[PDB]
């Protein structure tokens, strides 16, 4: 995240980091004790993913961290990177052993399609992650967060590449400087309503940070809620 600030411990307890050959290549969000939601473009065939919850500073041991392996990967069935890398950009990861929920490790709420969309349209969300702190810069050591305003469809389409508005939205400031970056993809775009946070988007591509566009692009979670609920149900 560029132009954000340090999260405090336990401020974003639904946030996870994904680690592979390189650490913090993507983020994700806790759906429940057994399941993470992330971006499909983060989870290529053949590559191992390790999930860490309760993470704050990725180079220090805080004694809040819970590391888990991924035993099942469900990219959305419409996802095809050959056609569009960022369309239908959502996937679920099943964890090997359940997370132990606590103040540092807590699921994000996922409302139904109607309310997810209402919450998105409130017009300001939190994005968070361990992505680069500016373009081509170092990965964040400490989790970053940023408030980003929703950008109107017309403005979104004029100023950004690969956008399929049915499934995606833009967010960020007209003047730029503030966006998700490489390493944040798959993490949460969240809307807080009277103290309860709801998942409104998946971080897809920080075009502003990548110098390819003026805003971040996000997968609209509203379109995917039934699929998420169906696949992740524990009972």
């Amino acid at each position: 995240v560029v132009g954000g600030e340090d999260a405090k411990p336990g401020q974003f307890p639904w946030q996870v980091v994904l680690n592979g050959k390189v650490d913090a290549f993507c983020g994700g969000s806790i759906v429940n004790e057994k399941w993470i939601v992330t971006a499909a473009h983060c989870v290529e065939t053949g590559v191992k993913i390790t999930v860490v919850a309760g993470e704050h500073n990725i180079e220090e041991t805080e004694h809040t961290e819970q590391k888990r392996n991924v035993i099942r990967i469900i990219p959305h069935h419409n996802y095809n990177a050959a056609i569009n890398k960022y369309n239908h950009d959502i996937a679920l990861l099943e964890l090997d052993e359940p997370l132990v929920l606590n103040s540092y490790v807590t699921p994000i709420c996922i409302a139904d399609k109607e309310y997810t969309n209402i919450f998105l349209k409130f017009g300001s969300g939190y994005v968070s992650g361990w992505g680069r702190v500016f373009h081509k810069g170092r990965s964040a050591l400490v989790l970053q967060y940023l408030r980003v305003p929703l950008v109107d469809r017309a403005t979104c389409l004029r100023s950004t590449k690969f956008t399929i508005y049915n499934n995606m939205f833009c967010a960020g400031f007209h003047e730029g400087g503030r966006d998700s970056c490489q390493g944040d993809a798959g993490g949460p775009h969240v809307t807080e309503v009277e103290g309860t946070s709801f998942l409104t988007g998946i971080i897809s591509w920080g075009e502003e940070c990548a110098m390819k566009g003026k805003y971040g692009i996000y997968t609209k979670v509203s379109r995917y809620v039934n699929w998420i609920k169906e696949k992740t149900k524990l009972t």
Partner: protein, 91 residues
């Protein structure tokens, strides 16, 4: 200044409380507005539901909550049903 509730200004069985130079109508369940003139409905303040509102058969609102919450006794609020409910900061 006199009892503004003398003229029974509350509809729908509202209870009238006399204040200085005004009255309040405390409405029974399902009614709202200054005179209890309105039916509670999802399009006015989300049917007073803390999370989710729907119209039920019989055209009354029903409130509901996401997983890990239970509808409170007031039939509007969503209260934790598990130790670490989704979407809450607790440190």
């Amino acid at each position: 200044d006199g009892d503004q509730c003398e003229s029974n200004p509350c509809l729908n069985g509202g209870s009238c409380k006399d204040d200085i130079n005004s009255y309040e109508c405390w409405c029974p369940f399902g009614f709202e507005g200054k005179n209890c003139e309105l039916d509670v409905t999802c399009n006015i303040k989300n049917g007073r539901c803390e999370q989710f509102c729907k119209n039920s058969a019989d055209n009354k609102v029903v409130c509901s909550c996401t997983e890990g919450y239970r509808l409170a006794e007031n039939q509007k609020s969503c209260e934790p049903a598990v130790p670490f409910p989704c979407g809450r900061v607790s440190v």
